[PDB]
From a paper:
Here, we describe the identification, biochemical and structural characterization of a new D-amino acid transaminase from Haliscomenobacter hydrossis (Halhy). The new enzyme is strictly specific towards D-amino acids and their keto analogs; it demonstrates one of the highest rates of transamination between D-glutamate and pyruvate. TAs catalyze the stereoselective transfer of an amino group from an amino acid/amine to a keto acid/ketone/aldehyde, producing a new chiral amino acid/amine and a new keto compound. Transaminases are usually homodimers, comprising two symmetrical active sites formed by the residues of both subunits.
Furthermore, Halhy is attractive as a potential biocatalyst because of its stability at 40–50 °C. We succeeded in obtaining the crystal structure of the holo form of Halhy with a resolution of 2.0 Å. The Halhy subunit consists of two α/β domains: a small domain (residues 1–114) and a large domain (residues 128–281), connected by an interdomain loop (residues 115–127). The contact analysis showed that Halhy is a homodimer in the crystal. The residues from both subunits form two symmetrical active sites in the dimer, with the PLP molecule covalently bound via a Schiff base to the catalytic K143. Additionally, PLP is coordinated by the conserved among TAs of PLP fold type IV residues: E176, forming a hydrogen bond with N1 atom of pyridine ring and R52, I202, T203, and T239, forming hydrogen bonds with the phosphate moiety of PLP. The phenyl oxygen atom of PLP forms a hydrogen bond with Y147 located on the α-helix of the large domain. Similar to the known TAs of PLP fold type IV, the active site of Halhy can be divided into two pockets: the O-pocket (near the phenyl moiety of PLP) and the P-pocket (near the phosphate moiety of PLP). The O-pocket of Halhy is confined by the side chains of residues F33, R28*, R90, and R179, forming a positively charged patch. Instead, in Halhy, the side chains of R28* and R90 are directed into the “carboxylate trap” place and could bind the α-carboxylic group of substrates. There are no positively charged residues in the P-pocket of Halhy, and the γ-carboxylic group can be coordinated by the side chain of S238 and the backbone nitrogen atoms of the β-turn 238STIK241.
Residue numbers in the entry:
A (entry chain A), B (entry chain A): 0 to 281
């Protein structure tokens, strides 16, 4: 039940022995991709979608995953079994590998790490969070790279300023995403708005959009002007750990009374239904 | 003489045992800074300047280096001594450390790695290299972060296209630097031009500028338009390993007959003199 093992390059290894040699290009060059997904009732959620993303991220960095997707899926199931857990967080990392020259990739290092189910997962607080705008555009935004400098560097500024997250705004004209979350507005006519370009295409994002459309809501995937914050009734984040999370304040703009909006609340319940349905196919 | 040891968190460690645990934020989040400098005759070159840069990079990521600069300088000298080498490459890495939550830094991991003197160091080929333009702007450009995704990802494209390096061009309007080098033009009136903003402030760059000014050349530190490639007689790179390196072709623009330009050649000899002078102070 406590996590006893990780997997490095297809070998189960006690957590206390899970190391990389310092020639690894993630350490020297931040060259890497990753994926992160929850497991509930002994099943990684929406697994084929997270794995297909992981394979697409690897090909963008010209990094070959040593195992095909069936073989990686087996190793993930074997690791859940070996740690004897049903509720977990799971991280896949694929690094540039042990490079001869501290720059050119050779063969990648593959890591499968495992965590308790995050405590906050799908908390679904009724009180929206408070975030700040930050001018920035992520590099290679469509690839899930290991590159979180700006997001991490900003943690002092976020806290200093009374916030618990931020939203990136490309040349401070275009709303994108947080470091770790996709961003949605709900207009007063109940139209759901989210960025279509220069973002990471979240799996959670995909499930909430599909669930919104199935419930008969209008969803626009489009460029979002900074000024549309002024027109929106609601704002929320999506991610693997957040599920759907109500944002109550961006800078001095309070959405409603700061509590979770109507459509936001309906989208939380639909996401929990997307998960329940997923688990019934396993 | 072969490298026997690295230093991790103030402890000398055999190279074969130099590892980090996979919770290190450089591995999970590419959160890190580094520095790299040569040693000749048993002395790291321009050391105080590289160390002051290393300390400035750390403070930008809010990462405290555990030792003051005198103590780090001692550890570097002790490591050269223990490996019994006079000619070396030296890498300092400071990672986000072993984070509890795979995101928030706690205390950093400090690495001192050591290499043979790179074979190519200050090669000073008379034949200029061939590079391509690439549209891109480095994140946090003034900090020497471990984030080289774009530069590394581009290696296939560079080689495919008949090149051995690139030059980054900010919104393809403004000339900046390569992934690993500063970039200079020499105008037909012998004015030396280099970017002043949104670049890493190289140590080599600093020494070549000082040496050019002392020789009585005009040096402009200014924004450089893409179209000024058309006006330049010469182009060169600077970096710790290149020293000064002649660029003979950018895309279909051949500088002269592709061989090292006049001022470029004089700046190579002045840099070797900057190094010789440095070593006489040790
Ligand atoms: C991981 C990540 C997300 C969330 O994607 P999910 O698949 O929903 O967890 C969003 N944006 C960025 C930048 C991310 O790295
Ligand atoms: C390290 C580096 C340089 C070169 O700096 P030097 O101190 O001259 O080696 C140039 N540009 C970038 C982006 C670098 O990381």
């Amino acid at each position: 039940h406590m996590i006893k093992y990780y997997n490095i390059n297809g070998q189960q290894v006690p957590v206390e022995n899970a190391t990389l040699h310092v020639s690894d290009l993630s350490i020297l060059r931040g060259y890497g991709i990753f994926d992160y997904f929850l497991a509930r009732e002994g099943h990684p959620l929406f697994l084929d979608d997270y794995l297909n993303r992981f394979y697409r991220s690897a090909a963008e960095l010209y990094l070959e995953i040593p195992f095909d997707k069936a073989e990686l899926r087996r190793q993930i199931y074997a690791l859940l079994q070996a740690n004897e857990v049903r509720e977990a967080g799971i991280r896949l990392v694929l690094t540039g590998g042990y490079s001869p020259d501290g720059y050119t990739p050779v063969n990648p290092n593959l890591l499968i790490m495992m965590y308790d189910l995050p405590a906050s997962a799908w908390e679904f607080s009724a009180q929206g969070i408070k975030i700040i705008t930050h001018p920035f555009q992520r590099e290679l935004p469509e690839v899930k790279t290991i590159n979180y400098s700006t997001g991490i560097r900003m943690l002092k500024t976020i806290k200093e300023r009374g916030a618990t997250d931020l939203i990136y705004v490309d040349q401070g004209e275009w709303i994108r995403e947080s470091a770790r979350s996709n961003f949605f507005l709900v207009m007063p006519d109940n139209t759901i708005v989210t960025a279509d370009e220069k973002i990471l295409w979240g799996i959670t994002r995909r499930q909430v959009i599909d669930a919104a459309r199935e419930a008969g809501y209008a969803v626009e995937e489009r460029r979002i002007h900074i000024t549309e914050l002024d027109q929106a009734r609601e704002a929320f984040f999506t991610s693997t750990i957040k599920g759907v999370m109500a944002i109550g304040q961006i800078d001095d703009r309070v959405f409603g009374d700061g509590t979770i909006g109507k459509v936001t609340q309906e989208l939380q319940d639909l996401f929990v239904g997307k998960v329940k349905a997923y688990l019934e196919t396993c």
